[PDB]
Ligand binder design. Structure first.
Ligand SMILES: Nc1nc2c(ncn2[C@@H]2O[C@H](COP(=O)(O)OP(=O)(O)OP(=O)(O)O)[C@@H](O)[C@H]2O)c(=O)[nH]1
Lengths: 642, 476, 135, 341, 62
RNA sequence: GGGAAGUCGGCUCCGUAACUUGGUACGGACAGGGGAAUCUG
RNA sequence: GGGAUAACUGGCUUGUGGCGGCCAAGCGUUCAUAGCGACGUCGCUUUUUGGAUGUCGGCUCUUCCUAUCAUACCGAAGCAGAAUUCGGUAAGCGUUGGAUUGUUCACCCACUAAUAGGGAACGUGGACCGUCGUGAGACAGGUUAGUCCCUACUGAUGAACUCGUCGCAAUGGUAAUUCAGCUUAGUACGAGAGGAACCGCUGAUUCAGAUAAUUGGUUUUUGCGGUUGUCCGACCGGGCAGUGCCGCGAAGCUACCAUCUGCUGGAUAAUGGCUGAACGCCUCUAAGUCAGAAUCCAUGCCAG
């Protein structure tokens, strides 16, 4: 049944930088943690970790967080954002509080990435006496009641379970002074928007909210505009600056030759090696696409091609994602195939080439893709397969980067790193590797079934893609008409341009032919063909630079753990059952002291939380069985142990 | 694959009757003015909305089914430009796309009008306006619907040409040899009557050569016009010559039996040769039976040899009538293109990197034949009677009667009863067709069967006689 | 062609929809989860079920992470509910098992562990060729 | 449910009615159509199947069969029917001398009280030289009647029930001139006809009975008059063979009845008809067996049937012994048989 | 599918009843009639040959 | 208790040595249990 | 604050827009020009490059209509085959979900032969008044508004016609559906890719009616065996745990959890014909008349 049962898992990456509409006896600016003045226990704990120099996303943020300003954070993964928001707690807290009530709230989207912030906290918080509890799904809802009675001061939690605790416990949420919403773009993607709203209303008006993320979708923007007070945008340096060491090339391909066009770039443009390679590899090409069904085609075709390729997509398994991003990072494979959401989750190393199998809809998505490569002064390349329907998104990419566009061989030596260069591929070698694609498609049924799935998956993606602008749409019609659209691309050399020129100067007259008589003229239908052709035949600086005003600039319903739509405020009865199961009294309010009893009644275990706790007695002894005496006392020993 | 799976496209009148009868037959049609105005409005809104969706699902069907020109091979978008004017084709489909956009706009506006209506008369007049306005939009669309119906019939009646595979292409001047050669090598329906252009469209056939499938394309013919002007018939020829990779076969009539001069035939080659520069060409001097290569004067031989001085042109001789050359002109051409294609295939895999692919590793493994190290061969137990045994021919009158023929005489697949004892071998025939005992006195007979049972039973007799003399069954 | 097995005599179906069954081939999957038994009748409140030899749609729940949380068709090869055979043998297997197979009838796995039901080997020749014990 | 069988109505009579006899033409020879029997139970067989095109071709197939105990009938009367524009109607009925006590019991309800007086004056009509009346009775049949039937009754003296009454019906004669079937029925008077003459092996018949009644836990559930068509006869047993259940590939001298007897029936010591599958009715119940109305259009008919074995093991429990000798030989000798001997 | 009361199915059945199952039922019925034969053979107003009277809602009572 | 459903489920601390009350290296331990079974001598 | 209609439809409703112009048979103030005026065509909407929905439901069941989604039959289409498309006769027989949603439809995805639409007096299980306000508003302000009988039918009985046996059959109900595999056959057809059907044969789903040999399930046979705790001082034998617990089990009942069975003649509709007038050609129709749908009416079946 599940042929797109719910929806395609990689949906779209809504991005926004209209989020700028939020706003000698002297160690002179050493740029270290001590220049910011952290705690003496905390700064040696940093030295235990190995953070000698703060990463740039820390260096901007942790100044502002101590000065108590709400910080929205643009930061790619792997930049050390996780430490960037907990070292202001180990600075803020410095001791365990005798009063009841946690003072730190950390909201994590997934279970596994919650443990990533968990492991950071004890790694950065040794020496002090802080208390941390984790509230994730799949754990018992009797253990999590008890860990609240252990009186923490940092609670890390998934918003589904934390709200379920909050409505069940009727916890006074006011004891928390600093809230962090880590990876909130992941939070809104899994459908926590309604539960984040009810959490936010219950958080106190006096709080310090930050929010660290990789991207800012438009729905996230309205959440901070209603949630965060006086937000400040912090961006990772030159994220929006495409690095000038990058050379780009855009190739005009048809829809039926897109697979063979990817085989051209790997074979003769990159000259990638075949097979497994004998810290990434030197070639190290990524492949970007649109849907998980396109991932499965592109991965499985390259296995049949013979290239070493790993693949990650949106609804990929937890363990399955680690092993493939491990293989790419240590250089055991050459190709990584991501959609966009798997890209923004996994940590991307220094990368050499980037292939765009499908053109990004927003021009800012292209920046995010080429931002993953050609960094830190090393040269890089970025190729994309443009189409006719994907052409207006390319002319919109011109207007954003402000670059010049060349069409095939309009210039003898176009500047790849500065000018957008479009054209066609080698004709001869494209028809060989699309012959191979059609040969494999006719041969193996499994790849053929993957084509039919990704054909209808693409047809949905075509319909729901954000449309291009009208001026970009109109100007796409002219360059299609223009003679440079089908000419050979500039990489392939001037020597390739001559024998292409001596042939297509004659060939273009075949394409420009207009039939004076359609074959139905060669009856009522014959009079009809004469009726169309008569109806539809062809129809016969003065401004100062200083001032010129230019038109251009410069009962609420939630989803429960059972998956059934439950009313938001539901008091089931488990705490009430909890409160005579051990017959506890009234819980503390916010402010009263902890009970040294209540911590030791419901403490933590030794630490290894095994998932297997099923204790059963063996079955009764059958006196005619083979192991009668062996079964006999082990049943009795079970009665002694109980 | 082909464009046969394009649904038939109706005229403007048949579009109107299909849409309007769908609205009447598949929805309720009875409403009385004494009913509530909320359900009077709900009745008429459903009728207007249903009409639009059937229009949109039909206008969307023709748009989706018809091929987009800028997605095909350059052979196909040029062929579909010549056959049907591509300027006229996207304005016919373009007209039907903006017609569906207006119909939803009519439907979107009139459901808003109906929602604020106040009488059954008002709702009746508002539906008739909407169904009438969609009717007069389709009736205006009459002219492009006839075009799209006619290009649909001719697209489904078009030969399947796949540019990727190995292709033999037969071209040349009209009335030389083309239809006779394609008929001689390939079973393919190609007319053979003797006038200027009998063939008006491309004809495709297929042939086999060392167990590999080859396709052959026959084309109408090209005149001496310098391709600035040609009609649609010969522009079909040069499109297949310019876009399809093929070992082309330029048939040349040495005799003037086509009525067209031999010096004109060379001038066509030198005009179209720039489209042939990459491929390999073979000029077939057809019809030597009436005029042989030694009979014409030595001046024309020199420029014929000058064609061979270009390294990509070969002289081949054949004569379709009497088939004096067609098999060896076929064996020559597909051999040269096979060794060309294998040269590219070994290059595609031995490119200047030093690493061979896994597809190359799999295919060298197939070619490798394992041979035992010692080199001895095992003894083969082929019986002597099978070497002189006569092969079975179904058209031979004197046939060995098979079990299929016995079946058809005695019934059919589900009537005939196979006799699995007629093939039994025994000591004598009447032991066959015998009921074989299975159970006797509550035990299996089969477990008690062995040869020398008679001698084994005598040991039971002798030992029983021993125990009777021993008195070991006596009561005390 | 719709994947309907032809010419089989019906037995007691012992694998309803939403039933966890073991995986017998070496494709890496360790568990399959039935969502659709094709060829089943259309009846209200009647859960579709399939016996040995019926080809079903399944989701991998246990196994190697490359093959986890994917949907493939499969053929039931063992079942635990007793069923009739035409010679009078009432018989059943120790577990419910199936093999991941393509819609044509070619299995992705290379070998089959455990026994193979007689009905599945007769209906699908590729499973019969890859079977070690046909019982 | 089905509207063809509604409303749920009890059968008006315990026996069962033929209702429709097969259409008669005189070209075939004379033959009777219906018969009774009494159901004894069910057992298993193995049949070597001879069906071309089936998966079970030429391999053993287990099959459930029923056993109906049929003692020989006795012909006692001949009723003739004339064809009126209000339907058929019985014109006259002729009986025979020496009606048995069991068939006379059917005419009575208190046999023990009533002195045996039925058909006493009719028997004097035969013997006191008023045989002119009997010949006038038969000549009226020959001249006016279009179809004739045989009044035949079964003997439950040999069938081991506790019922001493008998069961009468009309059995239609088909196939001949109305004169020819008169001499047929008159010759059958006071004579026992056997089921071997009525039906034969591998032929497909109809069974008429009343179903089981589901009383004592919306209305009458059960006890319905059902006729069920297309049941295949696998064996007619002769009773005196002493090898009734013996097949060609099982040479064990055994009768049809299982060890310990049929449950609530007893031992079948008479002719039995072994029929494919289930049959309407219960144990000890009268079963009316009837010929097919129409010529068969199936290959299930015209199919010769050969049997491998018949299950003579007990149905009072799980038994895996067919004969008493097999049970004794497997179990060895016991201490009760040692003390008795 | 074709109905059980379809005219083509009836005609196919009529050819089976005439050609295939016809003589088989005729031969079986001959053997049964021979068996019934073996069991069977094992003045007019004074002799009863002339039929007389034995021992009205159709006409109105006069 | 079971089946079904939904999920992302099942597949660091002690002692010892030099350095400044705190860190650094070495040695040991943590990061399992239960129930059901089969085959084999 | 006064006045006025007790209330709506009941040969209602459905598939083809409005406006202006041109043309226009007829009728008319006296005539086609005082003028009313259809079908078409022209101009506008409308063109030369391919989301909408308020209270409701949700399920089962009965019955009906056809405005037919499937299954049967035909007519037409570049309809080669395959798959279809449009239309007509047809209500015998069947007729889903999932994502999303306040809820539905549209669209998309999956299954299936298909998972059509409707009807059943739209089937059977506040209401003012008072008080305080008046640029707006209210009132823990009030009281008040505002429904257990008869009978049809079915089943089982039943008085009288003397009791009983075997029958006839007026009338009423009526039952079977759909798919697949083998052969035809890799065959017709086809350039290729592909690819049927009739006759014959064998299964399966649904539906209906039965049955208990065998295989599961169940144990007021309380049948056999083991076992827990109590008391009668002890044995025996008992009260005991409103039929203690644990194994196995006959019989009986059951199981879409097992097995069996489901049948043929006539007349037609759309349509295809034959002979042949009207009408000196011609025509399936007018008089005569052949074939033909899962249709109709009966047989088979149930009641009597
Ligand atoms: N003598 C001779 N005549 C030939 C030969 N081949 C073709 N022809 C002539 O050509 C006619 C066959 O048609 P072709 O000329 O081969 O067909 P075409 O070259 O496509 O030109 P069209 O006639 O337009 O079809 C025959 O009637 C012959 O008269 C040949 O080999 N020898």
């Amino acid at each position: 049944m599940p042929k797109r049962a719910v929806s395609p898992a990689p949906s779209e990456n809504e991005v926004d930088i209209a989020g700028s509409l939020f706003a000698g006896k002297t160690v002179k600016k050493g740029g270290g943690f001590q220049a910011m003045g952290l705690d003496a226990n905390l700064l040696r704990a940093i030295a235990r970790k190995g953070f000698s120099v703060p990463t740039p996303i820390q260096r901007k943020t942790i100044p502002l967080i101590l000065e108590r300003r709400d910080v929205v954070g643009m930061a790619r993964t792997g930049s050390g954002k996780t430490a960037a928001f907990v070292i202001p707690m180990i600075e803020r807290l410095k001791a365990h509080s005798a009063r009841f009530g946690a003072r730190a709230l950390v909201l994590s989207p997934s279970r596994e990435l919650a443990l990533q912030t968990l492991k950071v906290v004890k790694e950065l918080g040794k020496g002090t006496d802080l208390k941390t509890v984790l509230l994730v799904g799949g754990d018992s809802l009797e253990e999590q009641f008890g860990l609240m009675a252990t009186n923490p001061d940092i609670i890390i939690a998934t918003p589904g379970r934390f709200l379920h605790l909050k409505v069940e416990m009727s916890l006074d949420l006011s004891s928390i002074k600093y809230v962090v919403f880590d990876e909130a773009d992941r939070l809104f993607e899994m459908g926590f928007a309604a539960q984040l709203t009810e959490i936010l209303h219950a958080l106190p008006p006096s709080r310090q909210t930050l929010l660290f993320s990789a991207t800012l979708p438009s729905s996230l923007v309205e959440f901070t505009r209603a949630g965060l007070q006086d937000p400040v945008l912090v961006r990772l340096d030159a994220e929006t600056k495409v690095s000038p060491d990058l050379e780009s090339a855009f190739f005009s391909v048809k829809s039926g030759e897109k697979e063979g066009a990817l085989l051209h770039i790997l074979y003769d443009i990159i000259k990638m090696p075949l097979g497994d390679p004998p810290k990434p590899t030197e070639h190290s090409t990524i492949i970007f696409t649109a849907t998980k069904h396109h991932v499965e085609y592109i991965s499985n075709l390259l296995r049949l091609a013979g290239f070493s390729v790993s693949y990650v997509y949106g609804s990929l398994d937890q363990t399955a994602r680690k092993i493939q991003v491990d293989n790419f990072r240590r250089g055991r494979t050459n190709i990584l195939v991501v959609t966009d959401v798997a890209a923004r989750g996994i940590d991307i190393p220094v990368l050499a080439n980037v292939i765009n199998y499908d053109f990004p809809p927003q021009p800012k998505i292209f920046v995010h893709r080429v931002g993953r490569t050609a960094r830190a002064g090393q040269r890089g390349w970025a190729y994309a397969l443009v189409r006719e329907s994907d052409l207006p998104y390319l002319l919109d990419l011109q207007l954003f980067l402000g670059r010049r566009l060349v069409l095939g061989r309009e210039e003898k030596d176009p500047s790849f790193a500065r000018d957008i260069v479009v054209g066609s591929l080698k004709r001869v070698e494209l028809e060989n590797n699309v012959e191979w694609v059609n040969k494999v498609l006719h041969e193996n049924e499994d790849i053929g079934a993957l084509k039919r799935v990704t054909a209808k998956a693409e047809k949905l993606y075509m319909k729901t893609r954000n449309p291009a602008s009208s001026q970009s749409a109109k100007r796409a019609r002219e360059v299609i008409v223009s003679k440079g659209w089908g000419q050979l691309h500039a990489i392939f050399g001037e020597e390739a341009a001559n024998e292409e020129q001596v042939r297509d100067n004659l060939l273009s007259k075949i394409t420009g032919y207009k039939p004076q008589e359609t074959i139905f003229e060669i009856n009522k239908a014959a009079e009809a063909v004469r009726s169309f052709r008569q109806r539809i035949g062809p129809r016969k600086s003065f401004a100062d630079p200083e001032v010129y005003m230019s038109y251009t600039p410069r009962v609420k319903m939630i989803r429960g753990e059972s998956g059934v739509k439950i009313a938001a405020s539901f008091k089931s009865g488990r705490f009430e059952k909890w409160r005579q199961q051990h017959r506890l009294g009234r819980l503390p309010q916010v402010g009263e002291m902890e009970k040294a009893n209540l911590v030791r009644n419901f403490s933590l275990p030794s630490g290894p939380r095994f998932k297997h706790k099923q204790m059963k007695a063996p079955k009764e002894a059958d006196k005619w069985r083979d192991d009668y005496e062996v079964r006999k006392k082990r049943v009795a020993e079970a009665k002694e142990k109980r | 694959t082909g464009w046969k799976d394009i649904p038939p496209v109706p005229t403007a009148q048949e579009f109107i009757d299909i849409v309007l009868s769908r609205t009447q037959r598949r929805l309720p049609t009875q409403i009385r003015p004494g009913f509530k105005i909320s359900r009077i409005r709900a009745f008429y809104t459903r009728k207007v909305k249903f009409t639009q969706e059937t229009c949109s699902e039909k206008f969307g069907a023709i748009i989706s089914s018809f091929p987009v020109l800028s997605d095909q091979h350059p052979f196909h978008r040029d062929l579909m430009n010549i056959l049907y004017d591509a300027d006229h084709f996207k304005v016919a489909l373009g007209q039907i796309s903006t017609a569906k956009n207006l119909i939803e706009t009519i439907s979107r506006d009139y459901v808003r009008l109906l929602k604020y209506a106040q009488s059954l008369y008002q709702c009746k007049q508002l539906k008739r306006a909407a169904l009438g306005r969609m009717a007069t939009l389709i009736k205006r669309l009459k002219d492009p619907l006839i075009y799209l119906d006619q290009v649909r019939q001719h697209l489904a009646r078009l030969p399947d040409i796949n540019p990727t595979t190995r292709t033999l292409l037969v071209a040349g001047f009209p009335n030389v040899g083309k239809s006779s050669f394609v008929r001689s090598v390939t079973r393919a329906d190609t007319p053979v009557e003797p006038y200027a252009f009998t063939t008006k469209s491309l004809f495709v056939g297929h042939l086999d050569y060392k167990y590999l499938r080859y396709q052959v394309i026959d084309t109408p013919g090209i005149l001496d016009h310098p391709l600035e002007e040609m009609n649609t018939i010969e522009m079909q020829s040069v499109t297949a010559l310019a876009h399809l990779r093929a070992a082309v076969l330029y048939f040349m009539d040495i005799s003037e039996q086509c009525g067209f001069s031999l010096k004109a035939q060379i001038n066509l080659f030198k005009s179209i040769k720039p489209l042939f520069a990459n491929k390999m060409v073979f000029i077939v001097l057809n019809k030597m039976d009436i005029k042989k290569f030694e009979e014409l004067d030595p001046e024309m031989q020199q420029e014929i040899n000058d064609l061979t001085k270009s390294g990509e042109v070969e002289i081949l001789r054949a004569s379709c009538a009497t088939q004096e050359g067609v098999q060896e002109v076929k064996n020559h051409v597909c051999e040269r293109l096979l060794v060309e294609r294998v040269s590219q295939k070994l290059k595609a895999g031995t490119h200047s990197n030093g690493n061979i692919g896994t597809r190359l590793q799999e295919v060298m493994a197939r070619i490798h034949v394992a041979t035992p190290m010692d080199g001895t061969t095992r003894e083969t137990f082929i019986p002597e009677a099978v070497k002189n045994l006569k092969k079975y021919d179904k058209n031979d009158p004197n046939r060995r009667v098979l079990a299929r023929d016995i079946e058809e005489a005695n019934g059919g697949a589900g009537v005939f009863n196979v006799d699995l004892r007629k093939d039994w071998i025994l000591e004598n025939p009447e032991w066959k067709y015998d009921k074989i005992p299975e159970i006797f006195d509550g035990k299996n007979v089969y477990d008690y069967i062995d040869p020398d049972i008679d001698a084994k039973l005598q040991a039971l007799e002798e030992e029983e006689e021993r125990l009777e003399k021993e008195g070991f069954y006596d009561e005390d | 062609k719709r994947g309907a097995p032809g010419g089989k005599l019906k037995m007691t179906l012992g694998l309803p929809v939403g039933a966890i069954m073991n995986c017998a081939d070496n494709s890496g999957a360790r568990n399959l989860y039935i969502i659709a038994v094709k060829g089943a009748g259309a009846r209200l409140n009647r859960l579709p079920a399939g016996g040995v030899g019926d080809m079903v749609m399944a989701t991998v729940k246990k196994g190697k992470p490359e093959l986890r949380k994917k949907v493939h068709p499969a053929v039931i090869v063992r079942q635990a509910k007793p069923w009739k055979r035409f010679d009078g043998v009432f018989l059943y297997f120790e577990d419910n098992a199936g093999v991941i197979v393509n819609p044509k009838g070619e299995m992705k796995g290379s070998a089959i562990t455990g026994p193979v039901g007689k009905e599945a080997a007769e209906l699908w020749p590729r499973i019969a060729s890859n079977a070690g014990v046909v019982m | 449910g089905s509207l063809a069988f509604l409303p749920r109505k009890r059968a008006a009579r315990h026996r069962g009615r033929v209702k429709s006899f097969p259409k008669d033409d005189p070209k075939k020879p004379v033959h009777l159509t219906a018969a009774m029997g009494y159901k004894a139970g069910m057992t298993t067989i193995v049949r070597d199947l001879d069906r071309p095109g089936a998966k079970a071709h030429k391999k053993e197939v287990v099959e459930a069969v029923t056993i109906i105990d049929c003692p020989p009938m006795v012909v006692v009367g001949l009723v003739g029917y004339i064809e009126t524009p209000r339907g058929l109607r019985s014109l006259t009925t002729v009986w025979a001398e020496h009606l048995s006590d069991e068939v006379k019991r059917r005419f009575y309800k208190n046999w023990y009280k009533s002195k045996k007086k039925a058909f006493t004056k009719y028997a004097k009509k035969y013997a006191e030289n008023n045989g002119a009346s009997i010949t006038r009775e038969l000549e009226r049949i020959k001249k006016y009647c279009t179809v004739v039937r045989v009044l035949a009754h079964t003997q439950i003296r040999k069938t081991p029930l506790k019922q001493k009454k008998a069961h009468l019906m009309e059995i239609q004669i088909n196939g001949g001139s109305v004169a020819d079937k008169v001499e047929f029925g008159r010759s059958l008077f006071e004579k026992p006809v056997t089921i071997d003459t009525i039906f034969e092996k591998d032929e497909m018949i109809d069974v008429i009975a009343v179903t089981k009644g589901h009383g004592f836990v919306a209305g009458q559930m059960g006890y319905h008059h059902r006729t069920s068509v297309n049941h295949k006869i696998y064996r007619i047993g002769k009773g005196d063979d002493e090898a009734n259940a013996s097949t060609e590939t099982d040479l064990t001298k055994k009768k049809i009845t299982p060890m310990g007897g049929f449950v609530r029936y007893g031992e079948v010591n008479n002719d039995y008809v072994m029929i494919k599958g289930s049959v309407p009715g219960v144990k000890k119940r009268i079963m009316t067996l009837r010929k097919s109305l129409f010529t068969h259009t199936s290959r299930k008919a015209l199919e010769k049937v050969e049997l491998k074995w018949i299950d003579t093991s007990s149905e009072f429990g799980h038994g895996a012994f067919q004969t008493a000798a097999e049970k004794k030989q497997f179990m060895g000798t016991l201490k009760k048989d040692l003390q008795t001997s | 599918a074709k109905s059980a009361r379809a005219s083509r199915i009836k005609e196919n059945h009529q050819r089976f009843k005439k050609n295939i199952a016809g003589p088989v039922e005729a031969a079986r019925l001959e053997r049964l009639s021979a068996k019934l034969m073996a069991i069977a053979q094992a003045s007019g107003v004074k002799s009863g040959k002339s039929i007389g009277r034995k021992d009205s809602s159709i006409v109105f009572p006069m």
